[PDB]
Amino acid sequence: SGAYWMSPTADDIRAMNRMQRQRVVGFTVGRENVGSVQFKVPVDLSNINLDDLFGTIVILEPRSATVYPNAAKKPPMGKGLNVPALISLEHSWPRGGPTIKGRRLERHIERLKSIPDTTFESYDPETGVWAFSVEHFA
């Protein structure tokens, strides 16, 4: 477990004017002890309920980032939060855990690169964080 957060904060976004809230740049939803989703393009938050986002629209649990869990209420690609994003997930160690090193650790990284429907960004062997991009959440 861990606290969810967003950046810009919900209060920052509420203080934006009408043109600004339709194109929020750098929008990031994170959760302590899990990781983060950084949206890569400006997002229109004018019709999203910022008080019912965490755990409802964006769900972060260890090794699991989900955006729009209800298939009947998921906008098309390019609308809302269904847009390109950079996802960074803690706890992405080799199957044998944080102590795996050497040749197996090299192959682990190569297998992370091949995970379908992701574009590998990085793997940090010290922290166990795997980062990758997605084009959308469809």
Q: What is the C-alpha to C-alpha distance for residues 17 and 105, in angstroms, rounded to an integer?
A: 48
d(CA 76, CA 18): 22
Residue 42's Cβ-count burial label (10 Å; 0-12, 13-18, 19+) is middle
Query: Measuring CA to CA, which residue among 114, 109, 65 is closest to residue 85?
Result: 65
Beta-carbon neighbour count of residue 62 at 10 Å?
14
Contact (CB, 8 A) for 7 and 53:
no
Domain span at residue 37?
1-138
CB 36 within 8 A of CB 44: no
Place of tokens 């682990």: 108
Contact 10, 51 (CB under 8 A): yes
Residue listed under structure tokens 């999203």 = 48
* Beta pairing, strands 85-89 & 64-67: unpaired
Beta bridge partners of 36: 30, 88
Q: Which of 88, 42, 85 is nearest to 64 (CA)?
A: 88
CA pair distance 111, 122, nearest whole angstrom: 12
Q: Kindly tell me the burial class for residue 29, based on how many C-beta atoms sit within 10 Å of its own C-beta (0-12, 13-18, 19 or more).
A: buried
What's the number of domains the chain is made of? 1
Q: What method did the depositors use to determine the structure?
A: X-ray
Q: 67 near 60, Cβ under 8 Å?
A: no
- 113, two tokens: 């690169």
Resolution of this entry, Å: 1.3
CATH code for the domain of 66: 3.30.1610.10
Measuring CA to CA, how many Å separate 106 from each of 7, 69, 100, 118?
A: 34, 34, 10, 19
User: Do you find a cis peptide bond into 125, omega within 30 degrees of 0?
Assistant: no
| Residue 86 CB partners (closer than 8 Å, separation 6+) | 37, 38, 40, 121, 131, 132, 133
DSSP lists the bridge partners of residue 60 as 65
Contact (Cβ atoms closer than 8 angstroms) between residue 132 and residue 120: yes
Contact 25, 42 (CB under 8 A): yes
